[PDB]
């Protein structure tokens, strides 16, 4: 059972069951505990003797999720302060360069871990990967900004994240000239930002890009906006020197408020016109800082970004469903909300009936969700697809189409049922898709993603912009599609950002 590896800042302690070695827990960066809330990770001190990795560590400070999310999505929360670890499994640390998959938790940057039980890495292992998932730190922590603090702590980490695997990964039989990193939507998203980021240059080999593109980022200066109503909220200064001394519970209730105010109609008086206007979609997304991350990841990769990086990419079909759906209030959403909603993007009412024509939506709220879906993942998704017709790696895109049938199957193929199934963690996630989801999914697009590791191609066309060709995922047929919804597509070719 234990097996002893060491690593860069000494011996760890995994166990091997079933011819699985995992390691649980290994720290990348010393506990993040008040002034280091917000200092750049900082090496693990470098111990002597082993150190057990084989309990998940702690888990970043987060709120919950909102009531309705949160009945879907079942975080599992890790009390303490050294969260900054990660977690391998490994078929055999003595195997000789395994492609290795890092995994970044999305969550929208607020939550999540590297160690939610959907994100087990062992259905990787077993099929001659290793896997690696970590945490990183989230919401004011990870990523409020702050003048006395380097920017996006959380996207930092991320880095020592990859650098640790970079250094380490060879003793649990990794190539660290295989890496594929990938994460869904704020992990997505983060890959993006990392792609721009030239801290992570070299960092990764290939990227899956889970319903997250490079669209999210806060502005500097809504930045500056958001860190100044958390601290006038905590009645303090908004400056790390200030947060470092704030209890998390009141950094998270002032953080989830926050997201509240962002996530609905924001006051101008308190949030200024831009933010009041929408400028920010995730509050606590990277920020623009101007040196990790000198532009929106969308541009940088429309540039070149990651040009070197294998792309897969993918949404889900009805994603933004998971935020309008589940609480029974889709169908109270009225179309001249959503025409007022396409109006913020320079559309006119009928953009909707595009959506209608292509069984994007009955109803309003349907249409809405769908827009969203579109204005937040697929079409920045695309945009990123677009951006690498002449990128000398390879770009593969698809859909996740398979409907989960949870809440009377409103949610459709709903935000984050696609997890389970890259896992094979369908049993881990039925509060999501339900008791019976069809297994035979998992394994392929399991195996699409280990493939896709293992050699840069999923195994079915690479994604061009003639026929814009994606694998749609679904069960009982999972079989490729061209230029899904181009309708609706096609209306926001000239919508800014
Ligand atoms: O809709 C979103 O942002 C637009 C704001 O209006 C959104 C972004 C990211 C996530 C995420 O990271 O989800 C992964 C959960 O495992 C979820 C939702």
Same mark, same amino acid.
């Given at each position: 059972?234990?097996?002893?590896?060491?690593?860069?800042?000494?011996?760890?302690?995994?166990?091997?069951?079933?011819?699985?070695?995992?390691?649980?827990?290994?720290?990348?960066?010393? #506990?993040?505990?008040?002034?280091?809330?917000?200092?750049?990770?900082?090496?693990?001190?470098?111990?002597?003797?082993?150190?057990?990795?084989?309990?998940?560590?702690?888990?970043?400070?987060?709120? &919950?999720?909102?009531?309705?999310?949160?009945?879907?999505?079942?975080?599992?929360?890790? #009390?303490?302060?050294?969260?900054?670890?990660?977690?391998?499994?490994?078929?055999?640390?003595?195997?000789?360069?395994?492609?290795?998959?890092?995994?970044?938790?999305?969550?929208?940057?607020?939550?999540?871990?590297?160690?939610? #039980?959907?994100?087990?890495?062992?259905?990787?292992?077993?099929?001659?990967?290793?896997?690696?998932?970590?945490?990183?730190?989230?919401?004011?922590?990870?990523?409020?900004?702050?003048?006395?603090?380097?920017?996006?702590?959380?996207?930092?980490?991320?880095?020592?994240?990859?650098?640790?695997?970079?250094?380490?990964?060879?003793?649990?039989?990794?190539?660290?000239?295989?890496?594929?990193?990938?994460?869904?939507?704020?992990?997505?998203?983060?890959?993006?930002?990392?792609?721009?980021?030239?801290?992570?240059?070299?960092?990764?080999?290939?990227?899956?890009?889970?319903?997250?593109?490079?669209?999210?980022?806060?502005?500097?200066?809504?930045?500056?906006?958001?860190?100044?109503?958390?601290?006038?909220?905590?009645?303090?200064?908004?400056?790390?020197?200030?947060?470092?001394?704030?209890?998390?519970?009141?950094?998270?209730?002032?953080?989830?408020?926050?997201?509240?105010?962002?996530?609905?109609? &924001?006051?101008?008086?308190?949030?200024?016109?831009?933010?009041?206007?929408?400028?920010?979609?995730?509050?606590?997304?990277?920020?623009?800082?101007?040196?990790?991350?000198?532009?929106?990841?969308?541009?940088?990769?429309?540039?070149?970004?990651?040009?070197?990086?294998?792309?897969?990419?993918?949404?889900?079909?009805?994603?933004?469903?998971?935020?309008?759906?589940?609480?029974?209030?889709?169908?109270?959403?009225?179309?001249?909300?959503?025409?007022?909603?396409?109006?913020?993007?320079?559309?006119?009412?009928?953009?909707?009936?595009?959506?209608?024509?292509?069984?994007?939506?009955?109803?309003?709220?349907?249409?809405?969700?769908?827009?969203?879906?579109?204005?937040?993942?697929?079409?920045?998704?695309?945009?990123?697809?677009?951006?690498?017709?002449?990128?000398?790696?390879?770009?593969?895109?698809?859909?996740?189409?398979?409907?989960? &049938?949870?809440?009377?199957?409103?949610?459709?193929?709903?935000?984050?049922?696609?997890?389970?199934?890259?896992?094979?963690?369908?049993?881990?996630?039925?509060?999501?898709?339900?008791?019976?989801?069809?297994?035979?999914?998992?394994?392929?697009?399991?195996?699409?993603?280990?493939?896709?590791?293992?050699?840069?191609?999923?195994?079915?066309?690479?994604?061009?912009?003639?026929?814009?060709?994606?694998?749609?995922?679904?069960?009982?047929?999972?079989?490729?599609?061209?230029?899904?919804?181009?309708?609706?597509?096609?209306?926001?070719?000239?919508? #800014?950002?």
């Amino acid at each position: 059972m234990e097996i002893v590896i060491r690593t860069g800042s000494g011996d760890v302690r995994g166990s091997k069951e079933n011819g699985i070695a995992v390691f649980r827990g290994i720290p990348y960066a010393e #506990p993040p505990v008040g002034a280091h809330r917000f200092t750049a990770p900082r090496p693990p001190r470098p111990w002597d003797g082993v150190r057990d990795a084989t309990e998940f560590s702690a888990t970043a400070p987060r709120p &919950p999720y909102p009531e309705a999310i949160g009945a879907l999505l079942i975080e599992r929360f890790i #009390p303490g302060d050294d969260y900054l670890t990660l977690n391998v499994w490994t078929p055999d640390p003595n195997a000789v360069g395994l492609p290795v998959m890092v995994w970044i938790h999305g969550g929208a940057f607020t939550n999540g871990s590297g160690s939610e #039980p959907v994100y087990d890495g062992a259905a990787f292992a077993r099929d001659g990967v290793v896997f690696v998932s970590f945490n990183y730190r989230l919401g004011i922590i990870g990523f409020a900004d702050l003048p006395d603090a380097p920017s996006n702590r959380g996207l930092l980490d991320q880095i020592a994240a990859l650098e640790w695997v970079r250094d380490n990964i060879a003793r649990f039989g990794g190539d660290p000239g295989n890496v594929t990193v990938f994460g869904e939507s704020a992990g997505a998203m983060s890959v993006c930002t990392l792609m721009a980021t030239p801290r992570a240059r070299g960092l990764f080999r290939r990227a899956i890009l889970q319903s997250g593109a490079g669209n999210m980022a806060v502005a500097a200066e809504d930045a500056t906006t958001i860190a100044a109503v958390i601290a006038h909220r905590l009645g303090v200064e908004p400056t790390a020197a200030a947060l470092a001394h704030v209890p998390v519970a009141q950094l998270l209730d002032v953080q989830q408020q926050v997201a509240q105010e962002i996530q609905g109609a &924001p006051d101008p008086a308190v949030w200024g016109e831009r933010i009041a206007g929408g400028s920010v979609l995730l509050p606590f997304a990277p920020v623009i800082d101007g040196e990790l991350l000198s532009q929106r990841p969308a541009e940088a990769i429309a540039g070149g970004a990651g040009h070197d990086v294998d792309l897969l990419f993918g949404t889900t079909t009805d994603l933004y469903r998971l935020f309008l759906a589940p609480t029974g209030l889709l169908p109270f959403i009225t179309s001249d909300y959503v025409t007022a909603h396409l109006a913020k993007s320079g559309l006119d009412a009928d953009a909707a009936k595009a959506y209608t024509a292509e069984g994007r939506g009955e109803e309003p709220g349907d249409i809405l969700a769908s827009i969203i879906t579109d204005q937040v993942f697929r079409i920045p998704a695309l945009r990123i697809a677009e951006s690498r017709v002449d990128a000398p790696a390879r770009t593969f895109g698809y859909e996740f189409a398979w409907r989960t &049938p949870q809440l009377d199957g409103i949610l459709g193929a709903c935000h984050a049922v696609e997890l389970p199934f890259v896992f094979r963690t369908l049993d881990r996630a039925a509060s999501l898709v339900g008791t019976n989801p069809p297994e035979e999914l998992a394994e392929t697009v399991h195996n699409a993603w280990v493939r896709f590791a293992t050699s840069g191609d999923p195994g079915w066309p690479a994604w061009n912009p003639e026929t814009r060709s994606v694998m749609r995922f679904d069960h009982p047929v999972s079989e490729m599609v061209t230029d899904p919804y181009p309708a609706t597509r096609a209306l926001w070719d000239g919508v #800014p950002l």
